[PDB]
Amino acid sequence: TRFASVYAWNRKRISNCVADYSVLYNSASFSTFKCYGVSPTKLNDLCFT
């Protein structure tokens, strides 16, 4: 419900789980899907640190 302001934006750290990126074309349509270093269309097959 409550997000962060401009100066005091929050940092969230996530690991040891699975991120189902397949459920992405199902929300309020992202106006921005600008993805650099990465081709975002159905390429969720990589393991990040």
Place this chain on the structure above:
Amino acid sequence: ILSRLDPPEAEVQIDRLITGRLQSLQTYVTQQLIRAAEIRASANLAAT
């Protein structure tokens, strides 16, 4: 790179790589040819 990127940019990446590697190959070939010529000269002298 193949597993990561899309065709439109993978194209330019692989072109860059191909150009560099081809340049190296050509340089190596030229050096080998020159060395072979010198060896031929030495062989003729030895035969004489």
